[PDB]
């Protein structure tokens, strides 16, 4: 199965080599296309040529790539076209041990499989407190009735703590229960000029301390905090004090867009417009998956199938670009163009 994907990838990248009619192929390419096209035409009864010239030949080669991409991805598109009919036998073609795959394709699939099947630490994209319902004006005093220290969130990545003169307390629980961090990177600062409940300015005297797990931490320096050890603020000062604690970034085992090299650039390639046919085809193929059909996902995918499908579709887009096929898709209605940003934008519903 990983070999099946490695083969489809190998064949599609080889076809993207056919930029022109009379060019001379690197030997490696002809050896692969030869075997692949022969197995394919045999089990399918299509008549793909190794060096396409006419539009009909280009379409036919492109359809071979489409078949291979769908079979490796495990998708069955359904009747999307009067010109193309998916050949389920392609899976047999791709499982033939005689079709070789390249070192690049092999290594790329090993990556998809290796990272996708495990977990590892990664810098998450958004603010640690992005999913909060309430926020407090930054730098304005606020103490909850009966407490001497009150921590409150003032930004998507920030909290501020108000301390009564001489007060001390633990502040960690404000950070708990959200996300599932492995490490939280903090930097704390003295809020030098803040607003009192009444509206008048007040200063924070030097002398306030923040300690993590009992050890004293300087202000304005990154702190690696495990999220468990006690986060203790102490105002030894004889006046009210305010400190801000910023979560500069945190790491968890949720997958990000950096799980696979240049995943973002691949996703971008897949969701580009190109023209109405690609747009229609891409949409139709993605409808058979858990991926959005015309706009990049909000959260990065995290399973083998989604990642594979994106990689496979990105390569197919490149093949589309070099073969320039022309065929019909149900419900798609072409505009001669010559195609503009306005026209592209309108196609996204």
Which residue lies nearer to its own copies by CB, 70 or 112?
A: 112
Binds its own copies (CB under 8 A): choice among 81, 90, 246, 283: 246
Range 288-327, binding its own copies (CB under 8 A): 295-296, 298, 317-322
Distance CA 158, CA 99 (A): 56
CA angle 291, 292, 297 (to 5 degrees): 85
Which burial class, exposed, middle or buried, applies to 214 when counting CB atoms under 10 A from its CB (0-12, 13-18, 19+)? exposed
* Stretch binding its own copies (CB under 8 A), from 46-54, 57-65, 133-141, 326-334: 133-141
Distance CA 77, CA 88 (A): 11
Distance CA 335, CA 338 (A): 8
Q: Considering the rule CB under 8 A, would residue 197 count as an interface residue with its own copies?
A: yes
Distance CA 315, CA 52 (A): 19
Q: Considering the rule CB under 8 A, would residue 124 count as an interface residue with its own copies?
A: no
Range 84-113, binding its own copies (CB under 8 A): 97-104, 106-107, 109-111, 113
Q: Kindly state the smallest distance separating residue 305's Cβ from its own copies, in Å.
A: 17
Which residue lies nearer to its own copies by CB, 46 or 156?
A: 156
Q: Kindly state the smallest distance separating residue 332's Cβ from its own copies, in Å.
A: 16
Distance CA 178, CA 128 (A): 8
Q: Kindly state the smallest distance separating residue 113's Cβ from its own copies, in Å.
A: 6
Distance CA 5, CA 69 (A): 8
Which residue lies nearer to its own copies by CB, 165 or 222?
A: 222
In sequence order, the 6+-apart residues with CB closer than 8 A to the CB of 275 are: 334, 339
Distance CA 306, CA 298 (A): 14
Q: Considering the rule CB under 8 A, would residue 194 count as an interface residue with its own copies?
A: yes
In sequence order, the 6+-apart residues with CB closer than 8 A to the CB of 57 are: 48, 49
Binds its own copies (CB under 8 A): choice among 76, 216, 268, 330: 268
Range 154-193, binding its own copies (CB under 8 A): 156, 180, 182-183, 185, 187, 189-193
Q: How far is CA 27 from CA 34, 91, 194, 273, 319, in A?
A: 11, 26, 72, 34, 20
Binds its own copies (CB under 8 A): choice among 74, 92, 139, 227: 139
Q: Considering the rule CB under 8 A, would residue 261 count as an interface residue with its own copies?
A: yes
Q: Considering the rule CB under 8 A, would residue 220 count as an interface residue with its own copies?
A: yes
* Stretch binding its own copies (CB under 8 A), from 36-44, 62-70, 227-235, 272-280: 272-280
Q: Considering the rule CB under 8 A, would residue 38 count as an interface residue with its own copies?
A: no
**In this structure, are residues 141 and 240 in contact, taking their beta carbons and an 8 Å threshold?**
yes
Q: Considering the rule CB under 8 A, would residue 144 count as an interface residue with its own copies?
A: no
DSSP state of 112: H
Q: Which helix (H) or strand (E) holds 131?
A: none
Binds its own copies (CB under 8 A): choice among 43, 50, 89, 122: 122
Which residue lies nearer to its own copies by CB, 86 or 315?
A: 315
Q: Considering the rule CB under 8 A, would residue 118 count as an interface residue with its own copies?
A: yes
Which residue lies nearer to its own copies by CB, 64 or 106?
A: 106
**In this structure, are residues 46 and 40 in contact, taking their beta carbons and an 8 Å threshold?**
yes
Q: Kindly state the smallest distance separating residue 203's Cβ from its own copies, in Å.
A: 10
Task: Say how many residues touch its own copies, by CB under 8 A.
Answer: 115
Which residue lies nearer to its own copies by CB, 6 or 73?
A: 6
In sequence order, the 6+-apart residues with CB closer than 8 A to the CB of 45 are: none
* Stretch binding its own copies (CB under 8 A), from 46-54, 80-88, 243-251, 328-336: 243-251
């Amino acid at each position: 199965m990983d070999t099946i994907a490695a083969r489809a990838l190998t064949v599609m990248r080889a076809c993207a080599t056919l930029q022109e009619a009379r060019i001379v192929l690197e030997a490696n390419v002809m050896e692969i296309l030869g075997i692949a096209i022969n197995r394919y035409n045999g089990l399918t009864l299509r008549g793909v040529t190794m060096r396409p010239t006419s539009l009909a030949q280009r379409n036919e080669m492109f359809f071979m790539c489409l078949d291979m991409m769908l079979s490796a991805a495990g998708i069955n598109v359904g009747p999307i076209s009067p010109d193309y009919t998916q050949h389920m036998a392609t899976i047999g073609v791709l499982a033939t041990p005689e079709i070789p795959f390249t070192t690049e394709a092999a290594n790329e699939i090993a990556r998809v499989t290796g990272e996708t099947s495990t977990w590892g630490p990664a810098r998450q994209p958004y603010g640690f407190f992005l999913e909060t319902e309430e926020t407090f004006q930054p730098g304005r005093w606020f103490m909850r009735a009966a407490q001497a220290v009150t921590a409150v969130v003032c930004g998507p990545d920030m909290i501020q703590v108000s301390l009564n003169a001489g007060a001390r307390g633990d502040v960690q629980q404000i950070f708990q229960g959200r996300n599932d961090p492995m490490m939280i990177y903090l930097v704390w600062r003295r809020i030098e000029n803040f607003a009192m409940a009444q509206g008048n300015s007040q200063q924070t005297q030097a002398g306030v301390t923040v300690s993590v797990g009992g050890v004293d931490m300087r202000a304005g320096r990154i702190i690696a905090w495990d999220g468990q050890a006690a986060l203790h603020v102490h105002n030894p000062t004889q006046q009210n004090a305010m400190v801000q604690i910023q979560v500069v970034f945190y790491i968890s085992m949720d997958k990000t867009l950096n799980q696979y090299p240049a995943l973002t650039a691949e996703i971008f390639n897949v969701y580009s417009f190109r023209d109405h046919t690609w747009h229609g085809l891409r949409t139709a193929i993605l409808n058979r998956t858990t991926l959005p059909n015309m706009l990049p996902p909000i959260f990065p995918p995290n399973d083998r199938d989604s990642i594979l499908t994106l990689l496979l579709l990105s390569t197919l887009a490149d093949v589309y670009t070099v073969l320039r096929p022309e065929f019909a898709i149900h419900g798609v209605n072409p505009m001669p163009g010559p195609l503009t940003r306005a026209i592209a934008r309108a196609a996204y519903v």
